[PDB]
Amino acid sequence: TYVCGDCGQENTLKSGDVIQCRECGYRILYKKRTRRVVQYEA
Amino acid sequence: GLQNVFQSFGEMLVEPSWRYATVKFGEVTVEKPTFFSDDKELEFLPWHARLQ
Ligand SMILES: [Zn+2]
């Protein structure tokens, strides 16, 4: 699951050649943060 | 700036040693930056160039 840039769409592409957003044109993707528990010491 | 640079340079005749070839330069025009994508033309921004 990857988030695009100016366009809002889930890429979810894992192929080596798939780097371009679908129906967007731009090739900038951001990795989405999943629901994982992380512990911090205050 | 660019117009004066191109106007100052004068191209003379080209002869290998009748036929001869001479070139000339007209008005210089500069277009806005544009990203040449595979699908279609897209807007180009400084942060797009920084990330790519
Ligand atoms: Zn997109």
JSON list of C-alpha atoms and ligand atoms in Angstrom, two decimals:
[
{"chain": "A", "resi": 1, "resn": "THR", "atom": "CA", "xyz": [0.00, 0.00, 0.00]},
{"chain": "A", "resi": 2, "resn": "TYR", "atom": "CA", "xyz": [1.49, 3.30, -1.20]},
{"chain": "A", "resi": 3, "resn": "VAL", "atom": "CA", "xyz": [-0.02, 6.78, -1.14]},
{"chain": "A", "resi": 4, "resn": "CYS", "atom": "CA", "xyz": [0.49, 9.07, -4.13]},
{"chain": "A", "resi": 5, "resn": "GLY", "atom": "CA", "xyz": [1.39, 12.77, -4.01]},
{"chain": "A", "resi": 6, "resn": "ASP", "atom": "CA", "xyz": [-0.93, 15.53, -5.18]},
{"chain": "A", "resi": 7, "resn": "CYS", "atom": "CA", "xyz": [-3.40, 12.81, -6.22]},
{"chain": "A", "resi": 8, "resn": "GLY", "atom": "CA", "xyz": [-5.24, 10.81, -3.58]},
{"chain": "A", "resi": 9, "resn": "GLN", "atom": "CA", "xyz": [-5.16, 7.13, -4.53]},
{"chain": "A", "resi": 10, "resn": "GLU", "atom": "CA", "xyz": [-3.83, 3.90, -3.04]},
{"chain": "A", "resi": 11, "resn": "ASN", "atom": "CA", "xyz": [-1.18, 2.44, -5.34]},
{"chain": "A", "resi": 12, "resn": "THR", "atom": "CA", "xyz": [-0.56, -0.92, -3.61]},
{"chain": "A", "resi": 13, "resn": "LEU", "atom": "CA", "xyz": [2.07, -1.78, -6.22]},
{"chain": "A", "resi": 14, "resn": "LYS", "atom": "CA", "xyz": [4.92, -4.17, -5.42]},
{"chain": "A", "resi": 15, "resn": "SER", "atom": "CA", "xyz": [6.35, -4.75, -8.91]},
{"chain": "A", "resi": 16, "resn": "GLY", "atom": "CA", "xyz": [9.81, -3.47, -9.76]},
{"chain": "A", "resi": 17, "resn": "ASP", "atom": "CA", "xyz": [8.60, -1.63, -12.86]},
{"chain": "A", "resi": 18, "resn": "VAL", "atom": "CA", "xyz": [5.35, -0.31, -11.33]},
{"chain": "A", "resi": 19, "resn": "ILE", "atom": "CA", "xyz": [6.51, 3.08, -10.03]},
{"chain": "A", "resi": 20, "resn": "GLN", "atom": "CA", "xyz": [3.98, 5.34, -11.75]},
{"chain": "A", "resi": 21, "resn": "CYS", "atom": "CA", "xyz": [0.64, 6.17, -10.14]},
{"chain": "A", "resi": 22, "resn": "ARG", "atom": "CA", "xyz": [-2.46, 4.79, -11.84]},
{"chain": "A", "resi": 23, "resn": "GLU", "atom": "CA", "xyz": [-4.54, 7.40, -13.71]},
{"chain": "A", "resi": 24, "resn": "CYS", "atom": "CA", "xyz": [-2.35, 10.15, -12.23]},
{"chain": "A", "resi": 25, "resn": "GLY", "atom": "CA", "xyz": [0.88, 10.35, -14.24]},
{"chain": "A", "resi": 26, "resn": "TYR", "atom": "CA", "xyz": [3.19, 11.41, -11.41]},
{"chain": "A", "resi": 27, "resn": "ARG", "atom": "CA", "xyz": [5.82, 8.95, -10.18]},
{"chain": "A", "resi": 28, "resn": "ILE", "atom": "CA", "xyz": [6.03, 10.05, -6.52]},
{"chain": "A", "resi": 29, "resn": "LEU", "atom": "CA", "xyz": [4.68, 7.59, -3.94]},
{"chain": "A", "resi": 30, "resn": "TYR", "atom": "CA", "xyz": [4.63, 7.65, -0.14]},
{"chain": "A", "resi": 31, "resn": "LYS", "atom": "CA", "xyz": [4.57, 4.54, 2.03]},
{"chain": "A", "resi": 32, "resn": "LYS", "atom": "CA", "xyz": [1.45, 4.35, 4.19]},
{"chain": "A", "resi": 33, "resn": "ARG", "atom": "CA", "xyz": [1.63, 3.75, 7.94]},
{"chain": "A", "resi": 34, "resn": "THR", "atom": "CA", "xyz": [-0.25, 0.64, 9.07]},
{"chain": "A", "resi": 35, "resn": "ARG", "atom": "CA", "xyz": [-1.91, -0.04, 12.44]},
{"chain": "A", "resi": 36, "resn": "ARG", "atom": "CA", "xyz": [1.04, -1.21, 14.54]},
{"chain": "A", "resi": 37, "resn": "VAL", "atom": "CA", "xyz": [1.60, -0.74, 18.27]},
{"chain": "A", "resi": 38, "resn": "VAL", "atom": "CA", "xyz": [4.76, 1.17, 19.21]},
{"chain": "A", "resi": 39, "resn": "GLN", "atom": "CA", "xyz": [5.87, 1.80, 22.80]},
{"chain": "A", "resi": 40, "resn": "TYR", "atom": "CA", "xyz": [7.56, 5.03, 23.91]},
{"chain": "A", "resi": 41, "resn": "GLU", "atom": "CA", "xyz": [9.03, 6.04, 27.26]},
{"chain": "A", "resi": 42, "resn": "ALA", "atom": "CA", "xyz": [7.87, 9.46, 28.47]},
{"chain": "B", "resi": 1, "resn": "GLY", "atom": "CA", "xyz": [19.95, 38.59, -22.12]},
{"chain": "B", "resi": 2, "resn": "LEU", "atom": "CA", "xyz": [19.66, 35.61, -24.46]},
{"chain": "B", "resi": 3, "resn": "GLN", "atom": "CA", "xyz": [18.50, 37.79, -27.37]},
{"chain": "B", "resi": 4, "resn": "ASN", "atom": "CA", "xyz": [21.67, 39.90, -27.16]},
{"chain": "B", "resi": 5, "resn": "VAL", "atom": "CA", "xyz": [23.81, 36.75, -26.92]},
{"chain": "B", "resi": 6, "resn": "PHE", "atom": "CA", "xyz": [22.26, 35.20, -30.03]},
{"chain": "B", "resi": 7, "resn": "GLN", "atom": "CA", "xyz": [22.27, 38.51, -31.93]},
{"chain": "B", "resi": 8, "resn": "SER", "atom": "CA", "xyz": [25.96, 39.17, -31.22]},
{"chain": "B", "resi": 9, "resn": "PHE", "atom": "CA", "xyz": [27.05, 35.82, -32.69]},
{"chain": "B", "resi": 10, "resn": "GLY", "atom": "CA", "xyz": [27.31, 36.11, -36.46]},
{"chain": "B", "resi": 11, "resn": "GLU", "atom": "CA", "xyz": [27.48, 32.92, -38.52]},
{"chain": "B", "resi": 12, "resn": "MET", "atom": "CA", "xyz": [29.54, 33.32, -41.69]},
{"chain": "B", "resi": 13, "resn": "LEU", "atom": "CA", "xyz": [29.41, 31.16, -44.81]},
{"chain": "B", "resi": 14, "resn": "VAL", "atom": "CA", "xyz": [30.41, 27.50, -44.61]},
{"chain": "B", "resi": 15, "resn": "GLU", "atom": "CA", "xyz": [32.59, 26.19, -47.45]},
{"chain": "B", "resi": 16, "resn": "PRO", "atom": "CA", "xyz": [34.38, 22.81, -47.29]},
{"chain": "B", "resi": 17, "resn": "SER", "atom": "CA", "xyz": [37.00, 23.95, -49.83]},
{"chain": "B", "resi": 18, "resn": "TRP", "atom": "CA", "xyz": [29.00, 26.62, -56.65]},
{"chain": "B", "resi": 19, "resn": "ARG", "atom": "CA", "xyz": [27.15, 25.47, -53.52]},
{"chain": "B", "resi": 20, "resn": "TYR", "atom": "CA", "xyz": [27.41, 27.07, -50.09]},
{"chain": "B", "resi": 21, "resn": "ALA", "atom": "CA", "xyz": [25.45, 26.83, -46.84]},
{"chain": "B", "resi": 22, "resn": "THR", "atom": "CA", "xyz": [24.68, 29.73, -44.50]},
{"chain": "B", "resi": 23, "resn": "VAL", "atom": "CA", "xyz": [22.66, 29.65, -41.28]},
{"chain": "B", "resi": 24, "resn": "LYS", "atom": "CA", "xyz": [20.79, 32.35, -39.37]},
{"chain": "B", "resi": 25, "resn": "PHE", "atom": "CA", "xyz": [19.05, 32.72, -36.02]},
{"chain": "B", "resi": 26, "resn": "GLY", "atom": "CA", "xyz": [15.73, 34.48, -35.46]},
{"chain": "B", "resi": 27, "resn": "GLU", "atom": "CA", "xyz": [13.83, 35.47, -32.35]},
{"chain": "B", "resi": 28, "resn": "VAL", "atom": "CA", "xyz": [14.69, 33.36, -29.30]},
{"chain": "B", "resi": 29, "resn": "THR", "atom": "CA", "xyz": [11.69, 32.05, -27.34]},
{"chain": "B", "resi": 30, "resn": "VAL", "atom": "CA", "xyz": [11.76, 30.13, -24.06]},
{"chain": "B", "resi": 31, "resn": "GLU", "atom": "CA", "xyz": [8.85, 28.01, -22.82]},
{"chain": "B", "resi": 32, "resn": "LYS", "atom": "CA", "xyz": [7.89, 27.16, -19.26]},
{"chain": "B", "resi": 33, "resn": "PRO", "atom": "CA", "xyz": [9.27, 23.92, -17.76]},
{"chain": "B", "resi": 34, "resn": "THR", "atom": "CA", "xyz": [7.09, 20.88, -18.40]},
{"chain": "B", "resi": 35, "resn": "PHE", "atom": "CA", "xyz": [7.53, 17.24, -17.40]},
{"chain": "B", "resi": 36, "resn": "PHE", "atom": "CA", "xyz": [7.52, 14.92, -20.43]},
{"chain": "B", "resi": 37, "resn": "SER", "atom": "CA", "xyz": [5.66, 11.94, -18.99]},
{"chain": "B", "resi": 38, "resn": "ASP", "atom": "CA", "xyz": [4.82, 8.79, -20.92]},
{"chain": "B", "resi": 39, "resn": "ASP", "atom": "CA", "xyz": [1.06, 9.35, -20.67]},
{"chain": "B", "resi": 40, "resn": "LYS", "atom": "CA", "xyz": [0.66, 13.12, -21.13]},
{"chain": "B", "resi": 41, "resn": "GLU", "atom": "CA", "xyz": [2.24, 16.45, -20.26]},
{"chain": "B", "resi": 42, "resn": "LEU", "atom": "CA", "xyz": [2.16, 17.32, -16.56]},
{"chain": "B", "resi": 43, "resn": "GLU", "atom": "CA", "xyz": [2.85, 20.41, -14.49]},
{"chain": "B", "resi": 44, "resn": "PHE", "atom": "CA", "xyz": [6.47, 20.65, -13.34]},
{"chain": "B", "resi": 45, "resn": "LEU", "atom": "CA", "xyz": [7.31, 22.01, -9.89]},
{"chain": "B", "resi": 46, "resn": "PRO", "atom": "CA", "xyz": [10.63, 22.53, -8.06]},
{"chain": "B", "resi": 47, "resn": "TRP", "atom": "CA", "xyz": [9.80, 19.94, -5.39]},
{"chain": "B", "resi": 48, "resn": "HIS", "atom": "CA", "xyz": [8.89, 17.43, -8.10]},
{"chain": "B", "resi": 49, "resn": "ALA", "atom": "CA", "xyz": [12.39, 17.88, -9.53]},
{"chain": "B", "resi": 50, "resn": "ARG", "atom": "CA", "xyz": [13.93, 17.70, -6.05]},
{"chain": "B", "resi": 51, "resn": "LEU", "atom": "CA", "xyz": [12.20, 14.39, -5.26]},
{"chain": "B", "resi": 52, "resn": "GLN", "atom": "CA", "xyz": [12.79, 12.87, -8.72]},
{"chain": "C", "resi": 1, "resn": "ZN", "atom": "ZN", "xyz": [-1.61, 9.90, -8.26]}
]
